[PDB]
Design a protein around this ligand. Structure first.
Ligand SMILES: Nc1ncnc2c1ncn2[C@@H]1O[C@H](COP(=O)(O)OP(=O)(O)NP(=O)(O)O)[C@@H](O)[C@H]1O
Ligand SMILES: Nc1ncnc2c1ncn2[C@@H]1O[C@H](COP(=O)(O)OP(=O)(O)NP(=O)(O)O)[C@@H](O)[C@H]1O
Lengths: 560, 559
DNA sequence: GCCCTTTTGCAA
DNA sequence: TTGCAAAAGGGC
């Protein structure tokens, strides 16, 4: 209820205003202290500012020689707190430096910095109450305010809550050394969003096989286990090429009713049912590559729909698929001229090949251009998982349904990169096509993003630049700010930063966002696991230190 | 049990907290001193911190003129000690700077640094005892605490112990200039791990041919000799292309029963027995060098399994292998059309070649297989890539623990491709096995600057993603500046010997902040076997150790 | 990493 | 017989 110290000086140091505070022997003897990085209230001219404690140093006050006095007391062996109160009362001062960050105005908005420097005689500094801190953070907890690991510097009641307005339609970056909590942070945010706001969809690109089932003691549990614990049914769609191994695994950990929580789907299709899909994939593979699809590929890409009415034209497409190595289902009848062959049988295949046009004959001749499709082909599938995912995420059925689509990238081997690029392109094109009718309203979860946001001409770069218009959020983790382009870093809205050991990383971070210049020293020298610095635009344009929650504790606590 | 001096000031300097200590005439007369780099205890507000002595200088205390006083005493032949005790009490002061490293939490983890700056009247500084130091380092000795070469800074009873939790799933950097003990440190750590925790596997990429046998006086013995000394049997798998020479050396230097300790396997295979492996290697080469595989290679890669059931396609595959220069075993027969040939004979080889599609294009582009000559040997019939994969990640090999050593020089110029292929295969298998068994093995590589850069980033991926699967890295480079910051910023354990260059210490400090406190010691103290160690997050501060010789470790352990 | 150079088929 | 395409290796 009273000022902590006395303000004795103030100035403008660069783009910020700073002031000097002095703590007296009485206040120090009452146990009053100020922690570095602590948030305080500054009253000046009838206006309230938020301030941060930056520095602290000892300096003599008045006419005194603290060194001589203390050395003499030590030499003569006098207990300074019991024999010489007046000697103890002339050296027990302490100095602090406080920077003004801005002030809260009108409807919770933040006015940054200031043009008015406060005179010393009329400036006061106050300890901030939990109600004030709660208002500061607010205008399903994910973390709570903390200062380092000091006792008394923890505020379990001051929390930052998850809210779809914070994440959907906006870009979030998750940085930190390996082993410090990026994946746990992501999973806690996603579980809270799924539990509290069930109309938000997620597209998780799982490259390490950890976001569905995770039983080893090296990470937090998976989303399937979290959803089973919280009683969330029928919201996970898992795509994989190991649909039998994963089905076996799910039954040991989710029990006999695992199908109520997870739906396993294959990443394989029958290309004798989707020749247009085969041709489109072969055509797009080269655009995603350097450049210049061939003329015989553009011709097919544009005219295969026309060809479908001509059995002679379609016979050459099926022959190209069969010659590239794709296995047909037993009893597949191909009609040529005035005869029907069974390509599944070697004798009929040879007969038709010997017995065998708008550009389809060139496609048949250059059949080895389809061999890569054999990484996706499986006879008897007839699914088109690309379209299946498209209506999972952007289907008109939703208008708010909630769909967590998890892609098991490793199972695809060396086709995963091409598959990811193609799927992202399709989803973004559909989202653009639906503009003005419905919003996408889903979040792309992207780990090790430095492999996706490198080239400016990439679909992921384009999504990061233009997803806010169409309602697509992005949440990307990289372990190192220096791995991300500065153009993306500067345009990112939300930041969640754990410990970074390198000076270059913190320099890049503060070069991207100025307010991050006040925590670089803490980041460099405090390796604490699960301790985050969070920054949100435009309502919390300043860094706040949060202690993040374990997913196990969150699950055990949300049952109440 | 009493404070050393008096604290006269404190402040925040950069990311750390410092305080100033003054030593008085009585304490200086009693002989009490503080060594630079010594660890002390700081008591403040009922809490104990660990501090390090960083600086020391002489400064006048009070209103005095030490220069004039001392000069006058020297001029007037005045012996201060015996004649003027009062003039000697006003000049005999000394100053020290102490940095607060952090706070030890009993029943908990060390808390680094501090946000609370101590007032100068409430801080005390104490000397740390042997029990306190032992407790600090505890949270099979590998080294013992030592401060320089000064007498009284030697603590043989305060030791740092090898623990699998410090090394498995983590990265350890070993730096130092030539001849200062990096290889000895590596061998001591590996021998202690093998002896005490036999459930950890190792993959050593021996680029210098020193980790199996070492009989010269220019380095310490090898792992085979250490294991023979300690009685460890049936744990070393040695792969080489010089099997006969290495068997002769092993017999000569380990006796007749050397086969109970080392099992020697070749790095050669018969490609007429593994045509699918030949095609896979040819296909993976392009990706490993950053390019995109051609259509005729993707066709074979995806379709050779089907082709194996068609003798007409298999004839072209074998013809391509024979055209590339791969020697078949004596008496091999082909079955082109409904006829049989003997490609091992130069007559029927030409007969088939003149008597002669996906396989036809492979036969026409046969020169794509010539590099396989580096690994081909007729009549071998054992896939060494699969054998190594089973050794490191087997269903039953889990537990026992296996030490695989790769004799890289014997492969000549194919070693780079072999190493990249093996690492990619092992990482893919480890990722696929996530949830059923943990990899739990340590990749050991010397001259790491030659490995930690390549197209497709295989070693970058291993370093940045191996923690989840329990894949540890132990890489020695001899110069920090030669390691990318992308990999330096993900390292947890550091072991640094003397570095002469200024840029080396600057890079090390930029990579890990606390190493700013020992850079000046490193720059000016060339001591062999003196290592500064740092372990996150159990010991997040630099501790100076004297490391043991493997020769002495073996004698100590034999009992 | 990117810009020549070659064998091979389809045409007219 | 030559122009034109298309895939692939080699030189820079
Ligand atoms: N908030 C937290 N509180 C306590 N322990 C935590 C917290 N977050 C993470 N951990 C611990 O850190 C371990 C690894 O967490 P993890 O989420 O995998 O970090 P990470 O940043 O993803 N490492 P990586 O993905 O390899 O770069 C967990 O198994 C926990 O033991
Ligand atoms: N801890 C130690 N105590 C005493 N002598 C040691 C110690 N470590 C190394 N030496 C001596 O130094 C020599 C060289 O050791 P070594 O381990 O090969 O250093 P190095 O770092 O590997 N030099 P290099 O690998 O050639 O760049 C040994 O043969 C010993 O004579």
């Amino acid at each position: 209820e009273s000022p902590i110290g006395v303000v004795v000086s103030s100035r403008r140091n660069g783009p910020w205003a700073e002031l000097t505070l002095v703590l007296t022997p009485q206040e120090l003897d009452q146990g009053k202290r100020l922690l570095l990085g602590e948030l305080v209230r500054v009253s000046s001219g009838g206006k309230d500012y938020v301030g941060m404690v930056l520095d602290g140093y000892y300096e003599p006050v008045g006419r005194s020689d603290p060194t001589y006095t203390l050395a003499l007391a030590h030499i003569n062996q006098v207990d300074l707190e019991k024999e010489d109160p007046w000697a103890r009362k002339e050296v027990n001062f302490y100095h602090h430096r406080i920077v003004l960050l801005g002030r809260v105005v009108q409807g919770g908005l933040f006015a940054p910095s200031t043009r008015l420097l406060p005179p010393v005689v009329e400036a006061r500094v106050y300890r901030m109450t939990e109600e004030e801190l709660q208002r500061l953070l607010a205008a399903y907890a994910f973390g709570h305010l903390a200062y380092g690991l000091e006792e008394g510097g923890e505020y379990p009641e001051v929390v930052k809550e998850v809210d779809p307005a914070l994440f959907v339609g906006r870009r979030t970056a998750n940085f930190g050394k390996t082993g410090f909590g990026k994946s746990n942070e992501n999973k806690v945010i996603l579980t809270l969003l799924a539990h509290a706001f069930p109309r938000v969809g997620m597209l998780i690109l799982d490259q390490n096989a950890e976001y569905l089932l995770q039983t080893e003691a090296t990470t937090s549990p998976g989303l399937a286990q979290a959803f089973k614990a919280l009683g969330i049914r029928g919201r996970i769609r898992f795509y994989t090429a190991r649909e039998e191994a994963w089905a076996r695994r799910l039954k040991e950990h989710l029990g006999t009713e695992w199908r109520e929580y997870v739906e396993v789907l294959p990443l394989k299709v029958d290309f004798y049912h989707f020749p247009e899909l085969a041709v489109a994939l072969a055509y797009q593979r080269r655009r995603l590559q350097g450049a210049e699809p061939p003329q015989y590929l553009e011709n097919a890409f544009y005219n295969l729909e026309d060809w479908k009415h001509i059995p002679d034209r379609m016979a050459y497409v099926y022959g190209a698929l069969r010659k590239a190595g794709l296995t047909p289902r037993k009893g597949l009848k191909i009609k040529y001229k005035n005869e029907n062959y069974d390509i599944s049988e070697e004798k009929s295949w040879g007969n038709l090949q010997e017995a065998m046009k708008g550009g389809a004959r060139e496609l048949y001749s250059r059949a080895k251009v389809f061999s890569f499709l054999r990484a996706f082909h499986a006879p008897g599938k007839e699914a088109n998982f690309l379209e299946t995912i498209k209506e999972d995420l952007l289907g008109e059925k939703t208008e708010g349904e909630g769909k967590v689509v998890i892609l098991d990238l490793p199972s695809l081997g060396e086709a995963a990169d091409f598959f990811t690029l193609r799927l992202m392109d399709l989803l973004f094109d559909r989202a653009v096509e639906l503009y003005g009718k419905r919003q996408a309203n889903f979040l792309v979860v992207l780990e090790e993003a430095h492999n996706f946001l490198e080239d400016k001409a990439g679909i992921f770069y384009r999504v990061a630049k233009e997803g806010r218009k169409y309602g697509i959020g992005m949440l990307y983790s990289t372990q190192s700010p220096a791995s991300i382009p500065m153009e993306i870093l500067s345009q990112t809205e939300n930041f969640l930063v754990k410990h970074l050991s390198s000076e270059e990383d913190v320099k890049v971070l503060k070069r991207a966002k100025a307010p991050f210049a006040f925590v670089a020293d803490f980041l460099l020298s405090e390796p604490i696991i699960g301790y985050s610095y969070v920054y949100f635009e435009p309502y919390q344009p300043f860094v706040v230190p949060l202690r993040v929650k374990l997913l196990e504790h969150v699950l055990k606590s949300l049952d109440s």
